[PDB]
Amino acid sequence: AGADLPFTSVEAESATTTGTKIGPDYTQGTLASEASGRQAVRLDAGQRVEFTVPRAANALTVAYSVPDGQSGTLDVYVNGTKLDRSLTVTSKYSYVDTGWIPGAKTHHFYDNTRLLLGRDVQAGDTVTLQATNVQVTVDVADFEQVSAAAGQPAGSVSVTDKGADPTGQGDSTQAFRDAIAAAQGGVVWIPPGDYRITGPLSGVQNVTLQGAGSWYSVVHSSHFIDQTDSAGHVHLKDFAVIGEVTERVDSSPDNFVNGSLGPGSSVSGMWIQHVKVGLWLTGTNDDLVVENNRILDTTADGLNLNGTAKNVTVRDNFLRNQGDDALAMWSLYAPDTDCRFENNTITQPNLANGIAIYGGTDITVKGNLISDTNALGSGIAISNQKFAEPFHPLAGTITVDGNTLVRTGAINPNWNHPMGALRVDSYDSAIEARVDITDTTITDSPYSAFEFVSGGGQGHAVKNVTVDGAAVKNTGTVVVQAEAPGEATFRNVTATGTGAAGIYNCPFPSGSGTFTVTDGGGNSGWDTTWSDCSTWPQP
Ligand SMILES: [Ca+2]
Numbered sequence: 001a002g003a004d005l006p007f008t009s010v011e012a013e014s015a016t017t018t019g020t021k022i023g024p025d026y027t028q029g030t031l032a033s034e035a036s037g038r039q040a041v042r043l044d045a046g047q048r049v050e051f052t053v054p055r056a057a058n059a060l061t062v063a064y065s066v067p068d069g070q071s072g073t074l075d076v077y078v079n080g081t082k083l084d085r086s087l088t089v090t091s092k093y094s095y096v097d098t099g100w101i102p103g104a105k106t107h108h109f110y111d112n113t114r115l116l117l118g119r120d121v122q123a124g125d126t127v128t129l130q131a132t133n134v135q136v137t138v139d140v141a142d143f144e145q146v147s148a149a150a151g152q153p154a155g156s157v158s159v160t161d162k163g164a165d166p167t168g169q170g171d172s173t174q175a176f177r178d179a180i181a182a183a184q185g186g187v188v189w190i191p192p193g194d195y196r197i198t199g200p201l202s203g204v205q206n207v208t209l210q211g212a213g214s215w216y217s218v219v220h221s222s223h224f225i226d227q228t229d230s231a232g233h234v235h236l237k238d239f240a241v242i243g244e245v246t247e248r249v250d251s252s253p254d255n256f257v258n259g260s261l262g263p264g265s266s267v268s269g270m271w272i273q274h275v276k277v278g279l280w281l282t283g284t285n286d287d288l289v290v291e292n293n294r295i296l297d298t299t300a301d302g303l304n305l306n307g308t309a310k311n312v313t314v315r316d317n318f319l320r321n322q323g324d325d326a327l328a329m330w331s332l333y334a335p336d337t338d339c340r341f342e343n344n345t346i347t348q349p350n351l352a353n354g355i356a357i358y359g360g361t362d363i364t365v366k367g368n369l370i371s372d373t374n375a376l377g378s379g380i381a382i383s384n385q386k387f388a389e390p391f392h393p394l395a396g397t398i399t400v401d402g403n404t405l406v407r408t409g410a411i412n413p414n415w416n417h418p419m420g421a422l423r424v425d426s427y428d429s430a431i432e433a434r435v436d437i438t439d440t441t442i443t444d445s446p447y448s449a450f451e452f453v454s455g456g457g458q459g460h461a462v463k464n465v466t467v468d469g470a471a472v473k474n475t476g477t478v479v480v481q482a483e484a485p486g487e488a489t490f491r492n493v494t495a496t497g498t499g500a501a502g503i504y505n506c507p508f509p510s511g512s513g514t515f516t517v518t519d520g521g522g523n524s525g526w527d528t529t530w531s532d533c534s535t536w537p538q539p
Contacts, residue, residue, distance in 0.1 A: 001404035002345040002369030003316040007144035008054040013039040019047040022137065026446050028375040028413060029105035031065060031137060036347055036372055038407065040139040043131035049138050053125040057143035059215060060127065061114040062087055063320065065137040068095040072134030078119055078127055087113045089136055093246050093274050096299050096323060103376055103413040107350040108323055110139055112296045116146065116215060149192050149212040150238065156187035166193025168220060173197050180207050190239050192216040200226035204234050205262055211239025214271035218242060222275060225257045229283055232262025240271035248276060248299040248323055255280050261288055268292050279303040290314045299323040307333035315342040322349045331359030335392035340364035353377035354408060358385055362396040371406040378423040379408030382435055385427035385455060394433035404441040409448060420451030420481050426460035433464065440470045446539060448481035452488060452515065459512025461486035473497055476539030478504045479526040485513030491520035500537030502526030
């Protein structure tokens, strides 16, 4: 499961250090709770963490936190020799409050900082991070092989020929606009450099915007593309869009893409960071492919298909440190139809879900690796929670296949009751789609594995659900947390290390009916039921 990625992560807590390990802790609002693996290494200015390089690499991304209000640098050594550049570390993009979200606490403590090494280290080499001028809590480091900067394709129109400033001083918005107009049906080239784009660009259609690689062609914008419609055939490729967003303003489109890329479009090879939402997509995006991107450090969702999406594929992306659902489909206005989230890797959404499907028709969630979620969500949520109107509830077949969910689920502070790793939630209406949950690996869940709930207390049925094939290991409470009326069939679910019981079956509200668990065969390790519905299984 997960994205096919040209990098390998090494947890700081698995490296050799003179600092202090923090965690594990799942408690909402703690520094350790937002760390990958629930653990990190605090480095005083004393102290270093020495990583053994896991693979050939020439680039480094580090997830870290520094105290709010402070900033500094983190030195890098390779084989005991100090590199001549350091990582910039700051709290500027961290420590986000969302008081309007009930139950949310201050969050978003970490950030990601990157550096080309100027060297190509190899497996067995040592990369050491040394704190010098600020206390740095290091979570995890990614070791990547980044290709050399690509050359300009023949016939493309360079933004610098239209007046763009690759030193990042002047505003390049008009130059990009002029290049797009001059390269209709063709390619706009973004040479290596830093480009300030106050933005937004609109009328982006019939054009490829291509950089030399997301480590070389860097756009600095907090409002890059914003348009309600487009003729489509837009291809965004191989550049970075890095904003300066430090808060979540729901009414402000402080996003990389806001609106419509039109039909037949694609987004690939991008590095998207320090925005509110990476891609807030509405309207016509038929057949859009969003693939092989990194979306890091966003104060809200990584990507949301907010209605009308048709045959959109989001695949092979890496998402870390989103401020809400990392990937979401919200079928307002018109159903998202035949869309798929496939083979993505998601870690540490600060609140809410790894993947959330709210309504929609014939949706696939396949092959994703989702780790370390927090209060207010699940690893995967398949949901009829509407939030607003006009909403289109789940319809057709929802295919949830081949996903791996690691340390997902959390106590919701609004109930003091937990959300499970994977939930089906008949929040505002009964499940009228078929929901097929197959070949799921659920590992080290702090609470329950599978949850079936009508989360608003309205008593709508969770039904038409089949769970077929699962490897469930080290579940804190129950394999099945059944709190909605309805029915589901379970086959081929193998559980080990279940903390409390196989099944908790206690539907609410009283008066809304029973939930029938059908044992379809092949199940093992969870053949017990929690005896007392008036109590809660504890981890
Ligand atoms: Ca960690």
